[model samples]
Target: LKNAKEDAIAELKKAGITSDFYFNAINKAKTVEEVNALKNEILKAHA
Candidate 1:
């Protein structure tokens, strides 16, 4: 959760809490490049 969005997404995936569409976007991202996408998903989820 600290720096790896991949780890975060994997956790979410195991919990059955994330959607396929969002997972697809997350999966498409590479390493550090995932920050903004993960941030955007967080913002939209909270909103």
Candidate 2:
């Protein structure tokens, strides 16, 4: 049970996704939408 649960959690965690760069994104952002847009763009880049 523990093994299966951990594996499932690991898989879900992997599916969650992440960003490769944050500093560059924030630097590129000039507005609120740009900031949020940068975040999503980072996610899409990874996805």
Candidate 3:
């Protein structure tokens, strides 16, 4: 994680994970699959 919150958020966005709710749950994410699930949900709803 970066020192700047916005910068960290931007990095996540660039990685194909863009969701405020999901970001807030990042601390609880225990695996890559969980994170991918969030990204998939975001894409499913938006696209």
Candidate 4:
């Protein structure tokens, strides 16, 4: 579970995003689809 959260953080960094809000949301994600949905939502919100 820790590794999964870290992986999400790494991916977020690769996308040039570094937000405590996003990190916490990603940490709470229980599935890949959930994480992806959050990622899309973040991107859309910024767009």
Q: Pick the candidate with the highest lDDT.
A: 4
- Give the per-residue Cα lDDT of candidate 3 at 2: 27
Model 2 C-alpha lDDT per residue in residues 8-47, reported as the tens digit of each score: 3344346573333454445545665665565556557667
Error of 4 at 31 (Å): 1.0
What are the lDDT scores of the predictions, listed in order?
Answer: 0.61, 0.49, 0.56, 0.78
lDDT of 1 by residue, 1-47 (tens): 34466676766656555566666656566755575567466556756
Task: Estimate TM-scores for all models.
Answer: 0.42, 0.44, 0.48, 0.63
Name the top TM-score candidate: 4
Model 4 per-residue lDDT tens digits across residues 1-47: 56766876787777778778888888899887788788778777776
Model 4 weakest lDDT span, ten residues long: 1-10
TM-score, cand. 1 vs. native: 0.42
lDDT of 3 by residue, 1-47 (tens): 22344444455678666557666755455565665565566657666
Residue pairs clashing in model 2 are: none
The candidate, 3 or 4, that scores higher on TM-score is: 4
TM-score of 3: 0.48
The better-scoring model by lDDT among 3 and 4 is 4
Off by over 4 Å in 2: 1-22
Error of 2 at 46 (Å): 0.2
